[PDB]
Amino acid sequence: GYVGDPSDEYYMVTFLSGIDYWKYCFEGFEDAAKAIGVTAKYTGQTDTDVSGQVAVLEQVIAQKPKGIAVTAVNSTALADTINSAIEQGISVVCFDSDSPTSNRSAYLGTGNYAAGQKAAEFLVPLVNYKGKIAVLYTVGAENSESRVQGFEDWCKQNAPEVSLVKVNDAGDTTVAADNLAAALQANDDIVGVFCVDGVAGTAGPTAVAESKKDLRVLAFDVDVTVLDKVKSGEIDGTVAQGMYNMGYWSLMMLYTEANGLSSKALPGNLDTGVVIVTKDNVDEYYP
Ligand SMILES: OC[C@H]1O[C@@H](O)[C@H](O)[C@@H](O)[C@@H]1O
């Protein structure tokens, strides 16, 4: 059953691996590991370098863990490595950002397309259903690309006078602020900014402030600096993800599969939910 052996290891593998976002994800992973009695391990690529993250995942596969929960920095570039891990007998699920062409057993995380629709439902009314919205996001990551597509589809169906400007945040807060600054310079009709991920939630408001433009801004994630800007009204809100539950249930699924406790293959998708954070509930999200 669920009496674990501490020599059995389960790895969480990330990108942008030092940011606080992963501390909440790993807290859930480790809490489940401790409840079962196995050992949770953490590592990742420190930036968004794709070949870098492939190498990190290879270093993990070489330690022969029982299971790996990985968030893929690119939608397809980790698929062969994931498939290799599974061929070597390691259980693999994806959390937070999927590798949907790989053989991973399950995805656990935000419903990213739906969250982009929810973001558009929030932001479009605030700009009175007209004008251009800058969408600042990590090109190549499945979760960011799906959030963008949900936002874009919602506007196409429900706000015909709204148009989008896509802006790469490049996984780098300095480059992201420069790229949004350039977008604002060239597009006088921008009225709002959707920061699609945590990098953009930091860089976006910074670029907006430096432009001195009065824009509607929806951040992503719950960095204290972002929450403080919701509380002051500098930005209009942010989007909180179920970080802890991504980690907790990734560990439970990995251990279940690795020990053959379920007669069927794992269920394919756990929706860990989003909450729109405004002044009304921002206090709940401080550490
Ligand atoms: O940009 C930093 C982080 O922001 C989050 O919104 C995404 O879910 C993560 O995949 C990403 O690593």
mmCIF file of C-alpha atoms and ligand atoms in Angstrom:
data_model
loop_
_atom_site.group_PDB
_atom_site.id
_atom_site.type_symbol
_atom_site.label_atom_id
_atom_site.label_comp_id
_atom_site.label_asym_id
_atom_site.label_seq_id
_atom_site.Cartn_x
_atom_site.Cartn_y
_atom_site.Cartn_z
ATOM 1 C CA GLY A 1 0.000 0.000 0.000
ATOM 2 C CA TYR A 2 0.960 3.547 0.943
ATOM 3 C CA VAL A 3 3.718 2.770 3.461
ATOM 4 C CA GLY A 4 6.676 4.271 1.675
ATOM 5 C CA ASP A 5 10.368 3.484 1.853
ATOM 6 C CA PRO A 6 12.547 6.589 2.386
ATOM 7 C CA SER A 7 15.170 5.297 -0.066
ATOM 8 C CA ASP A 8 12.557 5.658 -2.835
ATOM 9 C CA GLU A 9 12.918 9.073 -4.445
ATOM 10 C CA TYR A 10 10.444 11.307 -6.270
ATOM 11 C CA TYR A 11 11.776 14.336 -8.146
ATOM 12 C CA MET A 12 10.145 17.658 -8.972
ATOM 13 C CA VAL A 13 11.894 19.209 -11.997
ATOM 14 C CA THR A 14 11.308 22.804 -13.050
ATOM 15 C CA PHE A 15 12.544 25.795 -15.041
ATOM 16 C CA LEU A 16 13.198 29.275 -13.656
ATOM 17 C CA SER A 17 13.963 27.034 -10.719
ATOM 18 C CA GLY A 18 14.823 29.631 -8.097
ATOM 19 C CA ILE A 19 11.601 31.648 -8.071
ATOM 20 C CA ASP A 20 9.189 31.541 -5.149
ATOM 21 C CA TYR A 21 6.412 30.024 -7.297
ATOM 22 C CA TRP A 22 8.065 26.591 -7.076
ATOM 23 C CA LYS A 23 8.426 26.794 -3.274
ATOM 24 C CA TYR A 24 4.653 26.424 -2.955
ATOM 25 C CA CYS A 25 4.547 23.616 -5.529
ATOM 26 C CA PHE A 26 7.325 21.713 -3.779
ATOM 27 C CA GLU A 27 5.719 22.221 -0.350
ATOM 28 C CA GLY A 28 2.752 20.141 -1.526
ATOM 29 C CA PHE A 29 5.000 17.536 -3.182
ATOM 30 C CA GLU A 30 7.017 17.149 0.024
ATOM 31 C CA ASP A 31 3.955 17.097 2.286
ATOM 32 C CA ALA A 32 2.523 14.161 0.326
ATOM 33 C CA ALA A 33 5.917 12.444 0.267
ATOM 34 C CA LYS A 34 6.209 12.733 4.053
ATOM 35 C CA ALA A 35 2.672 11.429 4.560
ATOM 36 C CA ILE A 36 3.512 8.337 2.504
ATOM 37 C CA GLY A 37 7.087 7.947 3.743
ATOM 38 C CA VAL A 38 9.127 8.446 0.531
ATOM 39 C CA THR A 39 11.714 11.154 -0.193
ATOM 40 C CA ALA A 40 10.898 14.235 -2.269
ATOM 41 C CA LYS A 41 13.721 15.886 -4.234
ATOM 42 C CA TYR A 42 13.833 19.203 -6.085
ATOM 43 C CA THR A 43 15.850 20.578 -8.981
ATOM 44 C CA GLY A 44 15.461 22.561 -12.185
ATOM 45 C CA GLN A 45 16.967 24.762 -14.864
ATOM 46 C CA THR A 46 17.645 28.208 -13.446
ATOM 47 C CA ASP A 47 16.436 30.061 -16.583
ATOM 48 C CA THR A 48 14.324 29.040 -19.602
ATOM 49 C CA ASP A 49 17.142 27.475 -21.646
ATOM 50 C CA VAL A 50 15.611 24.456 -23.364
ATOM 51 C CA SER A 51 18.757 22.369 -23.847
ATOM 52 C CA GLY A 52 19.614 23.265 -20.258
ATOM 53 C CA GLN A 53 16.387 21.815 -18.914
ATOM 54 C CA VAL A 54 16.817 18.679 -21.048
ATOM 55 C CA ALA A 55 20.229 18.183 -19.425
ATOM 56 C CA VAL A 56 18.816 18.690 -15.920
ATOM 57 C CA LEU A 57 16.104 16.105 -16.589
ATOM 58 C CA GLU A 58 18.793 13.724 -17.865
ATOM 59 C CA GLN A 59 20.778 14.242 -14.635
ATOM 60 C CA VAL A 60 17.628 13.281 -12.719
ATOM 61 C CA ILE A 61 16.864 10.229 -14.871
ATOM 62 C CA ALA A 62 20.428 9.068 -14.157
ATOM 63 C CA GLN A 63 19.658 8.999 -10.409
ATOM 64 C CA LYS A 64 16.938 6.414 -11.176
ATOM 65 C CA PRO A 65 14.088 7.890 -9.105
ATOM 66 C CA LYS A 66 10.783 6.085 -8.800
ATOM 67 C CA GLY A 67 8.937 9.102 -10.197
ATOM 68 C CA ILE A 68 9.356 12.518 -11.779
ATOM 69 C CA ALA A 69 6.901 15.417 -11.897
ATOM 70 C CA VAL A 70 8.175 17.797 -14.563
ATOM 71 C CA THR A 71 6.995 21.156 -15.863
ATOM 72 C CA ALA A 72 8.235 21.541 -19.434
ATOM 73 C CA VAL A 73 9.755 24.865 -20.476
ATOM 74 C CA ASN A 74 8.871 24.030 -24.103
ATOM 75 C CA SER A 75 5.780 22.242 -25.397
ATOM 76 C CA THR A 76 7.649 19.505 -27.275
ATOM 77 C CA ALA A 77 11.415 19.696 -26.691
ATOM 78 C CA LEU A 78 11.331 17.566 -23.513
ATOM 79 C CA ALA A 79 9.074 14.871 -24.986
ATOM 80 C CA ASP A 80 11.825 12.470 -26.077
ATOM 81 C CA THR A 81 13.556 12.738 -22.686
ATOM 82 C CA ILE A 82 10.279 12.111 -20.851
ATOM 83 C CA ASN A 83 9.614 9.117 -23.102
ATOM 84 C CA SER A 84 13.116 7.821 -22.352
ATOM 85 C CA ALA A 85 12.493 8.092 -18.598
ATOM 86 C CA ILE A 86 9.287 6.061 -18.944
ATOM 87 C CA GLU A 87 11.065 3.487 -21.115
ATOM 88 C CA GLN A 88 13.638 3.161 -18.307
ATOM 89 C CA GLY A 89 10.822 2.370 -15.873
ATOM 90 C CA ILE A 90 10.388 5.785 -14.233
ATOM 91 C CA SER A 91 6.883 7.119 -13.652
ATOM 92 C CA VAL A 92 6.427 10.588 -15.140
ATOM 93 C CA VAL A 93 3.625 13.128 -14.882
ATOM 94 C CA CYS A 94 3.633 16.739 -15.993
ATOM 95 C CA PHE A 95 2.560 19.574 -13.718
ATOM 96 C CA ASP A 96 2.087 23.301 -14.302
ATOM 97 C CA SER A 97 3.156 23.268 -17.985
ATOM 98 C CA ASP A 98 2.464 20.206 -20.102
ATOM 99 C CA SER A 99 4.407 18.132 -22.634
ATOM 100 C CA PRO A 100 1.239 16.871 -24.350
ATOM 101 C CA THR A 101 2.912 14.907 -27.161
ATOM 102 C CA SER A 102 4.940 12.890 -24.644
ATOM 103 C CA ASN A 103 3.899 9.648 -22.954
ATOM 104 C CA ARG A 104 3.502 11.293 -19.540
ATOM 105 C CA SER A 105 0.654 9.673 -17.643
ATOM 106 C CA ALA A 106 -1.175 12.791 -16.471
ATOM 107 C CA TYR A 107 -1.177 16.570 -16.352
ATOM 108 C CA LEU A 108 -1.843 18.339 -13.042
ATOM 109 C CA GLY A 109 -2.234 22.096 -13.059
ATOM 110 C CA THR A 110 -4.189 25.063 -14.293
ATOM 111 C CA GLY A 111 -6.661 24.670 -17.105
ATOM 112 C CA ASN A 112 -4.569 27.128 -19.055
ATOM 113 C CA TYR A 113 -6.869 27.745 -22.034
ATOM 114 C CA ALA A 114 -9.840 28.275 -19.716
ATOM 115 C CA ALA A 115 -7.725 30.557 -17.518
ATOM 116 C CA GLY A 116 -6.953 32.709 -20.551
ATOM 117 C CA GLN A 117 -10.673 32.907 -21.237
ATOM 118 C CA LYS A 118 -11.211 33.895 -17.601
ATOM 119 C CA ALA A 119 -8.490 36.538 -17.920
ATOM 120 C CA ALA A 120 -10.281 38.028 -20.946
ATOM 121 C CA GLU A 121 -13.606 38.036 -19.087
ATOM 122 C CA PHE A 122 -11.854 40.076 -16.378
ATOM 123 C CA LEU A 123 -9.845 42.528 -18.472
ATOM 124 C CA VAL A 124 -11.997 43.229 -21.543
ATOM 125 C CA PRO A 125 -14.851 44.929 -19.597
ATOM 126 C CA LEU A 126 -12.283 47.067 -17.773
ATOM 127 C CA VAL A 127 -11.146 48.514 -21.131
ATOM 128 C CA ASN A 128 -14.768 48.990 -22.291
ATOM 129 C CA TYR A 129 -14.633 46.273 -24.956
ATOM 130 C CA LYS A 130 -12.333 48.200 -27.275
ATOM 131 C CA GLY A 131 -8.695 48.901 -27.959
ATOM 132 C CA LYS A 132 -5.563 46.791 -28.050
ATOM 133 C CA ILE A 133 -4.389 44.463 -25.274
ATOM 134 C CA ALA A 134 -0.707 43.584 -24.935
ATOM 135 C CA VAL A 135 -0.264 39.920 -23.998
ATOM 136 C CA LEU A 136 3.128 39.385 -22.310
ATOM 137 C CA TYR A 137 4.140 35.745 -22.086
ATOM 138 C CA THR A 138 6.880 33.110 -22.274
ATOM 139 C CA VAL A 139 6.924 32.018 -25.914
ATOM 140 C CA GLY A 140 7.206 28.258 -26.268
ATOM 141 C CA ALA A 141 5.827 27.159 -22.902
ATOM 142 C CA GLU A 142 2.605 25.176 -23.272
ATOM 143 C CA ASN A 143 0.869 26.833 -20.336
ATOM 144 C CA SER A 144 1.597 30.386 -21.520
ATOM 145 C CA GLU A 145 0.742 29.601 -25.150
ATOM 146 C CA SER A 146 -2.568 28.042 -24.085
ATOM 147 C CA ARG A 147 -3.428 31.003 -21.855
ATOM 148 C CA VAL A 148 -2.771 33.300 -24.810
ATOM 149 C CA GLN A 149 -4.942 31.205 -27.123
ATOM 150 C CA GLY A 150 -7.852 31.169 -24.667
ATOM 151 C CA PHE A 151 -7.626 34.949 -24.283
ATOM 152 C CA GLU A 152 -7.405 35.428 -28.056
ATOM 153 C CA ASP A 153 -10.351 33.112 -28.781
ATOM 154 C CA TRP A 154 -12.510 34.778 -26.115
ATOM 155 C CA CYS A 155 -11.885 38.218 -27.623
ATOM 156 C CA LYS A 156 -12.587 36.941 -31.134
ATOM 157 C CA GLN A 157 -15.942 35.522 -30.050
ATOM 158 C CA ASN A 158 -17.037 38.191 -27.569
ATOM 159 C CA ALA A 159 -15.152 41.476 -28.154
ATOM 160 C CA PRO A 160 -14.769 42.228 -31.871
ATOM 161 C CA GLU A 161 -13.358 45.726 -31.276
ATOM 162 C CA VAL A 162 -10.487 44.367 -29.134
ATOM 163 C CA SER A 163 -7.213 43.393 -30.798
ATOM 164 C CA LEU A 164 -4.069 41.835 -29.372
ATOM 165 C CA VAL A 165 -0.349 42.577 -29.441
ATOM 166 C CA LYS A 166 1.744 39.534 -28.556
ATOM 167 C CA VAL A 167 4.912 40.263 -26.577
ATOM 168 C CA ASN A 168 7.567 37.699 -25.655
ATOM 169 C CA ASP A 169 8.713 37.930 -22.039
ATOM 170 C CA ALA A 170 11.510 35.473 -22.952
ATOM 171 C CA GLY A 171 11.504 34.070 -19.420
ATOM 172 C CA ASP A 172 13.667 37.066 -18.446
ATOM 173 C CA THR A 173 12.340 40.049 -16.505
ATOM 174 C CA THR A 174 14.814 42.516 -18.051
ATOM 175 C CA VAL A 175 14.134 41.408 -21.635
ATOM 176 C CA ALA A 176 10.399 41.276 -20.897
ATOM 177 C CA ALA A 177 10.281 44.890 -19.716
ATOM 178 C CA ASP A 178 12.259 46.004 -22.780
ATOM 179 C CA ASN A 179 9.969 44.080 -25.134
ATOM 180 C CA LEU A 180 6.792 45.471 -23.581
ATOM 181 C CA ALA A 181 8.301 48.967 -23.577
ATOM 182 C CA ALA A 182 8.887 48.595 -27.322
ATOM 183 C CA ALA A 183 5.328 47.341 -27.865
ATOM 184 C CA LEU A 184 3.908 50.347 -25.984
ATOM 185 C CA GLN A 185 6.075 52.724 -28.042
ATOM 186 C CA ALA A 186 4.800 51.381 -31.367
ATOM 187 C CA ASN A 187 1.114 50.875 -30.463
ATOM 188 C CA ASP A 188 -0.671 53.998 -29.252
ATOM 189 C CA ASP A 189 -3.958 52.092 -29.004
ATOM 190 C CA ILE A 190 -2.874 49.681 -26.244
ATOM 191 C CA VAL A 191 -5.319 50.026 -23.341
ATOM 192 C CA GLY A 192 -4.491 46.982 -21.193
ATOM 193 C CA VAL A 193 -1.853 44.362 -20.432
ATOM 194 C CA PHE A 194 -2.388 40.672 -19.673
ATOM 195 C CA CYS A 195 0.695 39.352 -17.858
ATOM 196 C CA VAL A 196 0.371 35.657 -18.695
ATOM 197 C CA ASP A 197 2.921 34.179 -16.275
ATOM 198 C CA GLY A 198 5.042 35.128 -13.290
ATOM 199 C CA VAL A 199 7.902 36.661 -15.278
ATOM 200 C CA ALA A 200 5.398 38.962 -16.996
ATOM 201 C CA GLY A 201 3.675 39.710 -13.690
ATOM 202 C CA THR A 202 6.929 41.325 -12.542
ATOM 203 C CA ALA A 203 8.150 42.899 -15.775
ATOM 204 C CA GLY A 204 4.772 44.046 -17.085
ATOM 205 C CA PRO A 205 3.843 46.507 -14.347
ATOM 206 C CA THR A 206 7.436 47.785 -14.341
ATOM 207 C CA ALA A 207 7.352 48.642 -18.044
ATOM 208 C CA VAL A 208 3.885 50.162 -17.688
ATOM 209 C CA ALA A 209 4.994 52.428 -14.833
ATOM 210 C CA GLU A 210 8.050 53.592 -16.791
ATOM 211 C CA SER A 211 5.834 54.463 -19.778
ATOM 212 C CA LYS A 212 3.622 56.580 -17.470
ATOM 213 C CA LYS A 213 0.596 55.226 -19.353
ATOM 214 C CA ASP A 214 -2.684 54.632 -17.499
ATOM 215 C CA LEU A 215 -3.529 51.049 -18.428
ATOM 216 C CA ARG A 216 -5.636 48.204 -17.096
ATOM 217 C CA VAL A 217 -3.337 45.390 -15.990
ATOM 218 C CA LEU A 218 -4.072 41.752 -14.962
ATOM 219 C CA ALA A 219 -0.962 40.106 -13.401
ATOM 220 C CA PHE A 220 -0.282 36.357 -12.914
ATOM 221 C CA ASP A 221 0.704 34.592 -9.608
ATOM 222 C CA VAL A 222 1.011 35.945 -6.086
ATOM 223 C CA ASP A 223 4.479 37.362 -5.599
ATOM 224 C CA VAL A 224 4.253 39.821 -2.714
ATOM 225 C CA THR A 225 5.279 42.644 -5.051
ATOM 226 C CA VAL A 226 2.324 41.778 -7.309
ATOM 227 C CA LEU A 227 -0.101 41.518 -4.395
ATOM 228 C CA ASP A 228 1.038 44.923 -3.121
ATOM 229 C CA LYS A 229 0.190 46.421 -6.521
ATOM 230 C CA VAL A 230 -3.283 44.879 -6.449
ATOM 231 C CA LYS A 231 -3.784 46.288 -2.946
ATOM 232 C CA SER A 232 -2.685 49.788 -3.976
ATOM 233 C CA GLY A 233 -4.675 49.771 -7.213
ATOM 234 C CA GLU A 234 -1.558 50.123 -9.365
ATOM 235 C CA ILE A 235 -2.819 47.030 -11.210
ATOM 236 C CA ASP A 236 -6.344 45.646 -11.378
ATOM 237 C CA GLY A 237 -5.756 42.083 -10.211
ATOM 238 C CA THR A 238 -3.783 38.897 -10.508
ATOM 239 C CA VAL A 239 -4.473 35.192 -11.038
ATOM 240 C CA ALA A 240 -3.649 32.691 -8.298
ATOM 241 C CA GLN A 241 -2.931 29.061 -9.199
ATOM 242 C CA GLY A 242 -3.271 25.954 -7.043
ATOM 243 C CA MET A 243 0.479 25.519 -6.699
ATOM 244 C CA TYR A 244 0.480 23.357 -3.570
ATOM 245 C CA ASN A 245 -2.113 20.960 -4.986
ATOM 246 C CA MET A 246 -0.130 20.511 -8.195
ATOM 247 C CA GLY A 247 2.720 19.197 -6.085
ATOM 248 C CA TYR A 248 0.695 17.205 -3.555
ATOM 249 C CA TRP A 249 -1.356 15.279 -6.127
ATOM 250 C CA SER A 250 1.563 14.831 -8.525
ATOM 251 C CA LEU A 251 3.332 12.927 -5.742
ATOM 252 C CA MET A 252 0.232 10.869 -4.924
ATOM 253 C CA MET A 253 -0.234 9.908 -8.579
ATOM 254 C CA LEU A 254 3.444 9.088 -9.114
ATOM 255 C CA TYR A 255 3.626 6.846 -6.050
ATOM 256 C CA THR A 256 0.374 5.117 -7.003
ATOM 257 C CA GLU A 257 1.587 4.302 -10.508
ATOM 258 C CA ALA A 258 5.136 3.363 -9.497
ATOM 259 C CA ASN A 259 3.791 0.831 -6.995
ATOM 260 C CA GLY A 260 1.047 -0.592 -9.215
ATOM 261 C CA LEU A 261 -1.673 0.202 -6.683
ATOM 262 C CA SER A 262 -4.218 1.255 -9.337
ATOM 263 C CA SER A 263 -5.453 -1.375 -11.779
ATOM 264 C CA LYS A 264 -5.933 1.303 -14.451
ATOM 265 C CA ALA A 265 -3.641 3.922 -15.901
ATOM 266 C CA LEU A 266 -3.740 7.242 -14.087
ATOM 267 C CA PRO A 267 -6.488 9.776 -14.822
ATOM 268 C CA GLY A 268 -5.318 12.253 -17.410
ATOM 269 C CA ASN A 269 -5.993 15.716 -15.994
ATOM 270 C CA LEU A 270 -6.349 17.280 -12.555
ATOM 271 C CA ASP A 271 -7.599 20.888 -12.684
ATOM 272 C CA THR A 272 -6.007 22.635 -9.699
ATOM 273 C CA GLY A 273 -8.064 25.805 -10.271
ATOM 274 C CA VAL A 274 -7.535 29.551 -10.513
ATOM 275 C CA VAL A 275 -8.850 32.471 -8.460
ATOM 276 C CA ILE A 276 -9.003 36.089 -9.621
ATOM 277 C CA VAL A 277 -7.316 38.164 -6.905
ATOM 278 C CA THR A 278 -8.632 41.698 -6.380
ATOM 279 C CA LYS A 279 -8.575 44.111 -3.451
ATOM 280 C CA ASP A 280 -11.398 42.063 -1.906
ATOM 281 C CA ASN A 281 -9.346 38.891 -1.375
ATOM 282 C CA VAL A 282 -5.710 39.948 -1.828
ATOM 283 C CA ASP A 283 -4.992 39.710 1.905
ATOM 284 C CA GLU A 284 -5.608 35.945 1.803
ATOM 285 C CA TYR A 285 -2.580 35.372 -0.447
ATOM 286 C CA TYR A 286 0.254 36.951 1.533
ATOM 287 C CA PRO A 287 2.673 34.375 3.022
HETATM 288 O O1 LIG B 1 6.912 32.766 -15.346
HETATM 289 C C1 LIG B 1 7.145 32.071 -14.188
HETATM 290 C C2 LIG B 1 6.094 30.994 -13.977
HETATM 291 O O2 LIG B 1 4.765 31.656 -14.045
HETATM 292 C C3 LIG B 1 3.578 30.731 -13.876
HETATM 293 O O3 LIG B 1 2.465 31.500 -14.101
HETATM 294 C C4 LIG B 1 3.657 29.522 -14.793
HETATM 295 O O4 LIG B 1 2.540 28.684 -14.428
HETATM 296 C C5 LIG B 1 4.993 28.861 -14.666
HETATM 297 O O5 LIG B 1 5.048 27.756 -15.612
HETATM 298 C C6 LIG B 1 6.128 29.823 -14.955
HETATM 299 O O6 LIG B 1 7.398 29.156 -14.752
#
